[PDB]
């Protein structure tokens, strides 16, 4: 109990899902087909945990920064934690809005202890489906922060246009099966294994055919996290 996060609150917490599918022509970024299944599946599996889930589609950089800023300004006194899921294109340290890119650390900076008192010493969960630089394949973070990246920097983050992204497919699959039982790192480790073994890329370009993907968990947590 002294090595776990206190989950004795009225609600588990707020969960914001940003689903960016269509982008402005100036960005040159194609439509992310399959992300609608992801956003809806994430809505289901995260509600099952007990989260208050809200989904926004095709947000601008200004909008994304705004809704996360407004979220950190809310009262999280009777909440156990906070979760945020980002679904879009991306590069190193940045995620794509409909009108361009914005640094990820700027998005998470709002939920730091000095800007969000009601979430102090409570886990802030950030799940990110996006590429993080593909050359192979700054406000500091704080404690009680966790980043569940879909891939490792330098590698691709794959997405099946008819089924959804590999990371989200695996995430909800594990959450629906063991989300109430396992600790957060146990869940994410199984997500790692699921993505790493079950999936390989499909393409008539042999250079981009049968490629592999391994997710990346960055944990600054100070306690163990069970959703029950």
């Amino acid at each position: 109990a002294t090595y776990q996060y206190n989950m004795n609150f009225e609600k588990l917490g707020k969960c914001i899902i940003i689903n960016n599918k269509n982008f402005d022509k100036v960005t040159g970024m194609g439509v992310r087909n399959g992300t609608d299944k992801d956003a809806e599946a994430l809505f289901k599996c995260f509600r099952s945990l007990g989260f208050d889930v809200i989904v926004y589609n095709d947000c601008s950089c200004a909008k994304m920064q705004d809704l996360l800023k407004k979220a950190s300004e809310e009262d999280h006194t009777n909440a156990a934690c906070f979760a945020c899921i980002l679904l879009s294109h991306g590069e190193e340290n940045v995620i794509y809005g409909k009108d361009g890119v914005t640094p990820i650390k700027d998005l998470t900076a709002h939920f730091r202890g000095d800007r969000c008192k009601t979430l102090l010493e409570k886990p802030k969960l950030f799940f990110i489906q996006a590429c993080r630089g593909t050359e192979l394949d700054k406000i500091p973070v704080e404690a009680d922060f966790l980043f569940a990246y879909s891939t490792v920097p330098g590698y691709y983050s794959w997405r099946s246009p008819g089924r959804g992204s590999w990371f989200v497919q695996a995430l909800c699959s594990i959450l629906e099966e063991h989300g109430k039982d396992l600790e957060i790192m146990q869940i994410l480790t199984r997500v790692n294994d699921r993505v790493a073994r079950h999936f390989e890329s499909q393409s008539d370009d042999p250079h981009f055919h049968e490629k592999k993907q391994i997710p990346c968990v960055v944990s600054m947590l100070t306690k163990e996290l069970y959703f029950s």
Partner: peptide, 4 residues
């Protein structure tokens, strides 16, 4: 498959 597609990439992000």
């Amino acid at each position: 498959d597609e990439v992000d």
